Amino acid sequence: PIPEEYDDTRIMGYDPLIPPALLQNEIKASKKSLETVIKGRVDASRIIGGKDDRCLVIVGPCSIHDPEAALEYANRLKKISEELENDLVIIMRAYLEKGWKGLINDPNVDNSFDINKGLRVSRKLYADLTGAVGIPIGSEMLDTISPQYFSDLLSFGAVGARTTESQLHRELASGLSFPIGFKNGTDGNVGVALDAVQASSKGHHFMGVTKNGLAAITTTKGNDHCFIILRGGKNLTNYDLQSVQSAKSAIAKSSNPNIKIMIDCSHDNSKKDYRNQPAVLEDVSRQIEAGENALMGVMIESNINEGKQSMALKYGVSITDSCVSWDTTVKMLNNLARAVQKRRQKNG
Amino acid sequence: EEYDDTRIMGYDPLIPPALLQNEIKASKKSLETVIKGRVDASRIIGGKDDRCLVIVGPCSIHDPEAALEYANRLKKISEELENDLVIIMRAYLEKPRTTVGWKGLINDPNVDNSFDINKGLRVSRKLYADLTGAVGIPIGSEMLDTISPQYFSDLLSFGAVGARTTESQLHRELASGLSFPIGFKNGTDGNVGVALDAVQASSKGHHFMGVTKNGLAAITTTKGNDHCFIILRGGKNLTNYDLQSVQSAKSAIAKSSNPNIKIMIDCSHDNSKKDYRNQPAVLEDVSRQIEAGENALMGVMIESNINEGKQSMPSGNEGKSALKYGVSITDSCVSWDTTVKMLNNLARAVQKRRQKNG
Numbered sequence: 001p002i003p004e005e006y007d008d009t010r011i012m013g014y015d016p017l018i019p020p021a022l023l024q025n026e027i028k029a030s031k032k033s034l035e036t037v038i039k040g041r042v043d044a045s046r047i048i049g050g051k052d053d054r055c056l057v058i059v060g061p062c063s064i065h066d067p068e069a070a071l072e073y074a075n076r077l078k079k080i081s082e083e084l085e086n087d088l089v090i091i092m093r094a095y096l097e098k099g100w101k102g103l104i105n106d107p108n109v110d111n112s113f114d115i116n117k118g119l120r121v122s123r124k125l126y127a128d129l130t131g132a133v134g135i136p137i138g139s140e141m142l143d144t145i146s147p148q149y150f151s152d153l154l155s156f157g158a159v160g161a162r163t164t165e166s167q168l169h170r171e172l173a174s175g176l177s178f179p180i181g182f183k184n185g186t187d188g189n190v191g192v193a194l195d196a197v198q199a200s201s202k203g204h205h206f207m208g209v210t211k212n213g214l215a216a217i218t219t220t221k222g223n224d225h226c227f228i229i230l231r232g233g234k235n236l237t238n239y240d241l242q243s244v245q246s247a248k249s250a251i252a253k254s255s256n257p258n259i260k261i262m263i264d265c266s267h268d269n270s271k272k273d274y275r276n277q278p279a280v281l282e283d284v285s286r287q288i289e290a291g292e293n294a295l296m297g298v299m300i301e302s303n304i305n306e307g308k309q310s311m312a313l314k315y316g317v318s319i320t321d322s323c324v325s326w327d328t329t330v331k332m333l334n335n336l337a338r339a340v341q342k343r344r345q346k347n348g
Numbered sequence: 349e350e351y352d353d354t355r356i357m358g359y360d361p362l363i364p365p366a367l368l369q370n371e372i373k374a375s376k377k378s379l380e381t382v383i384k385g386r387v388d389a390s391r392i393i394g395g396k397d398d399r400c401l402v403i404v405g406p407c408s409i410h411d412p413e414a415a416l417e418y419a420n421r422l423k424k425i426s427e428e429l430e431n432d433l434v435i436i437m438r439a440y441l442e443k444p445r446t447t448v449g450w451k452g453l454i455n456d457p458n459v460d461n462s463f464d465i466n467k468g469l470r471v472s473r474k475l476y477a478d479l480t481g482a483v484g485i486p487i488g489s490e491m492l493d494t495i496s497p498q499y500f501s502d503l504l505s506f507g508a509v510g511a512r513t514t515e516s517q518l519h520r521e522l523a524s525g526l527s528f529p530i531g532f533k534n535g536t537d538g539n540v541g542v543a544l545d546a547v548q549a550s551s552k553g554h555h556f557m558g559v560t561k562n563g564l565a566a567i568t569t570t571k572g573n574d575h576c577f578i579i580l581r582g583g584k585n586l587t588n589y590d591l592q593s594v595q596s597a598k599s600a601i602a603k604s605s606n607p608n609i610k611i612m613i614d615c616s617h618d619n620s621k622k623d624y625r626n627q628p629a630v631l632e633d634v635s636r637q638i639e640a641g642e643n644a645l646m647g648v649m650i651e652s653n654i655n656e657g658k659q660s661m662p663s664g665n666e667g668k669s670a671l672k673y674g675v676s677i678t679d680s681c682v683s684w685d686t687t688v689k690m691l692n693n694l695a696r697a698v699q700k701r702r703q704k705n706g
């Protein structure tokens with residue numbers, strides 16, 4: 001006789017989720033939303049596959065905390081996306097979590113926990129970005145259960161530096177309906193990202209849930225639309241030319257010698273300082289301007305206002321990591337858009 | 349549906365975990381073996397017992413009949429060396445990563461390139477109940493996802509997080525809510541810092557997406573796991589079982605938030621250059637630092653079987669009839685006779701360290 005002190009000894013409690021098929025029906029994806037989602041996946045895939053000379057730009061706040069502040073940011077970002085449509089493909093970074101447990105964990109930013117209210121707030125936000133304004137969005141892929149609530153509204157997915165080697169995330173990447181980007185290792189390792197791209201191109205079996213919320217094993221087809229992201233190491237930056245050449249050499253000896261490179265301009269490449277973000281973009285832009293076709297895009301941590309605060313809170317200011325201003329951002333995107341114009345001039 | 353599940357071929361609903369636990373009930377003696385294995389370990393992680401925690405067994409269990417004979421052998425020697433060693437059997441149901449060959453007991457229980465997850469879950473769970481109950485040996489597994497542990501956690505005494513998942517926040521959250529000690533292996537480049545960071549993160553409460561006991565999607569609230577440690581395992585082209593590497597980690601633990609983190613050495617995998625013949629030489633070195641006085645060494649990890657070497661099973665004869673008995677079909681293990689030499693030398697090691705602490 002053992003009094004169930006062998007099971008869930010470290011589980012404070014379970015909070016059952018709303019079934020994804022029901023959340024997808026309560027907050028439905030409008031036709032204009034799915035039009036934006038499919039267009040974002042196709043436009044990004046053409047740049048990844050080498051069929052388009054434009055640059056894929058993943059720009060947005062490090063984390064989304066205020067839905068109304070993010071919806072006003074997207075209206076600014078969709079305007080500039082239409083003006084630079086000939087050279088840039090802009091996908092807004094709509095990350096839900098990284099002080100702040102996230103939008104799915106805490107919708108009211110008051111340190112509570114309402115996982116169901118978080119899913120409705122995050123999905124209705126996703127439905128408004130792709131529908132009300134009409135801009136493609138991308139999120140971070142954290143587990144094998146959350147994507148079942150947002151996959152019909154996502155056009156891009158990122159696997160962080162600390163999960164690129166995770167076999168579970170490589171399996172899930174093989175079953176996601178949008179292009180995936182693998183960041184290099186936390187020490188600057190490029191090889192682990194090439195291994196992730198190759199592994200995710202194969203069919204796999206991962207443990208997820210059905211649309212009704214039932215534990216089930218999933219059979220995947222493989223994701224042939226993947227790329228690597230250079231975000232630097234804990235002690236190094238790899239956005240410079242010698243580092244791109246080092247990555248280009250590693251790709252040439254891999255199983256996918258057509259892999260293109262995206263450069264994170266924030267995080268460790270900018271020493272976590274937003275003022276170095278424009279100077280980092282100038283370097284990669286000049287590499288592109290010289291005619292480097294292996295360079296595919298960039299990542300920009302931008303916001304309505306530059307800087308970072310804590311959690312009575314400033315409007316349009318990030319709460320996590322560090323962002324650049326909007327007046328800064330439009331210059332970064334304009335300077336990059338000219339570099340893309342100069343690249344295809346050398347390709348003519 | 350040109351936008352949803354465009355790369356999903358099909359779902360296979362799982363039997364609810366409570367139903368499997370009702371079909372393959374955990375015996376009273378099974379549970380008694382599980383709880384004792386957990387506390388026996390934890391006392392070594394916390395520095396309350398100078399014994400050595402041994403995680404020994406095959407790389408993957410493809411033959412339940414062969415595993416049951418190995419466990420009875422392991423149970424006999426574990427009782428002989430109970431004064432010095434705490435032995436937990438390796439009962440890994442899945443070889444991860446590399447796609448060539450077998451896919452694990454869960455996905456392929458018949459060992460013939462099949463897919464039968466519900467039949468594999470019944471076979472795997474029954475094997476766990478027989479090891480903990482019929483023979484009565486603690487067992488440990490690899491923590492791969494946040495759904496499968498709900499099927500075996502009531503029968504597990506130890507969990508392992510691979511080198512490719514130590515940095516993953518998802519597996520750090522899961523470790524914070526598991527009912528047994530967890531061991532984090534260093535990075536695939538030999539980096540020990542990510543292992544200390546994982547042990548620290550898993551000591552706090554977290555939230556992770558899992559399933560209820562009936563297989564329904566739910567978010568969990570964890571209490572925090574303070575029975576975690578690091579596993580020195582090696583790098584892509586290096587070994588870290590030597591005296592230089594152990595003390596580098598020991599000084600790194602000294603600057604962590606908990607200087608009581610003990611070190612376990614993986615005697616196989618990259619520390620043996622994926623060679624079963626180098627496992628005794630690696631353990632012999634580990635045994636010496638233990639016997640010279642080093643209390644930071646808490647245990648070892650050995651890949652062992654009834655017979656040494658390896659084999660393959662992919663084509664031709666259509667299954668188990670062409671396999672050798674007690675030979676692993678993944679990686680490479682030492683024979684049982686070698687394992688007896690290895691455990692007996694490590695036992696005398698724990699003895700002479702105990703004399704140096706009086």
Ligand SMILES: N[C@@H](Cc1ccc(O)cc1)C(=O)O
Nearest residue numbers: 144151176177208209352353
């Ligand atoms: N619906 C997801 C695929 C998926 C399936 C099951 C999961 O558990 C997670 C994701 C997509 O279209 O991308």
Ligand SMILES: N[C@@H](Cc1ccc(O)cc1)C(=O)O
Nearest residue numbers: 007008494501526527558559
């Ligand atoms: N039941 C597990 C904890 C757990 C909970 C939910 C899961 O989805 C997975 C694992 C244990 O006691 O160790």
Ligand SMILES: [Cl-]
Nearest residue numbers: 101553554555
């Ligand atoms: Cl958390």
